[PDB]
Each structure stands twice: as C-alpha cells, then as structure tokens.
C-alpha cells in the first residue's frame, strides 16, 4: 500500500502540515512508511500525536492537518466544491451546513482514485475539519 505520486506524501507535509511533529516522529513515520507499513499506520500515529498534542500545538496541528486535507479535498472534491465549502464557511455555515454539504459533494464525485480519501481521509478529516460535532 504505497502511493506513489509523491504529492500527498507525509515528506509533502513535514514543513508544513506535518511539521508539528518532532524529528524523531517525522522519522518514525519515515521509518514506517519507508518499511512497508500501511498508509493506514501513518493515519494512527498521527491521529495518536494529534490528540495527545498541547494547548496551542493541537490548535496548530488541527489547522495544519486542515490545510493537508484541504489539499487532498482540493483532489477528491476539486477547487469547485472545496471553494464552495470554504465560502461555506467564510458565509456562515456551521459545522452541520459544512457537514451537510460535505457529505453530497464528496458523494457526488464517485470517481474512484478520489472515493479512495474519502474512505482513507474522510472520517479522520472530519475530527480535523473537526465538524464532527458530538
């Protein structure tokens, strides 16, 4: 399970979404990923950083791993629906109207290299993009 593109990438992060983390994390997700681990172990110790982050660090981080998927809704659901849930925001929609919206423009692509973060990214992002309320 490599996803070799090199756009997405946890190294695409380190400077910038992921770069909260410390350098004995970064290269331990390295170390990982670069081992054959599953994306999907990348996922879990980040998501284990994140929620045993700090005051202002997990404000940072949650920002950052906001833009990371922001990034990756700008693949799955294009600059359209990205735009159209960013003006979402900016306009006033709550984190259910963003919930509401999300869920139909990250149904209505269906293309399948994009349904592939829905399913990898999707539930994570929605804690980050944390609209998951309640």
């Given at each position: 399970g490599s996803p070799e593109f090199?756009?997405?990438?946890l190294e695409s992060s380190?400077?910038?979404?992921?770069?909260?983390?410390?350098q004995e994390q970064k290269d331990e997700l390295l170390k990982m990923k670069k081992d054959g681990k599953a994306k999907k172990e990348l996922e879990a110790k980040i998501l284990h950083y994140y929620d045993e982050l700090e005051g202002d660090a997990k404000k940072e981080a949650t920002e950052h791993l906001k833009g990371g998927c922001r990034e990756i809704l700008k693949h799955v659901v294009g600059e359209e629906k990205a735009a159209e849930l960013k003006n979402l925001k900016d306009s006033g929609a709550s984190k259910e109207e963003l919930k509401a919206k999300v869920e139909e423009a990250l149904h209505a692509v269906t293309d399948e290299e994009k349904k592939q973060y829905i399913a990898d990214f999707g539930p994570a992002c929605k804690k980050i993009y944390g609209v998951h309320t309640s």
């Open positions: 090199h756009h997405f990438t380190l400077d910038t979404h992921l770069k909260w983390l410390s």
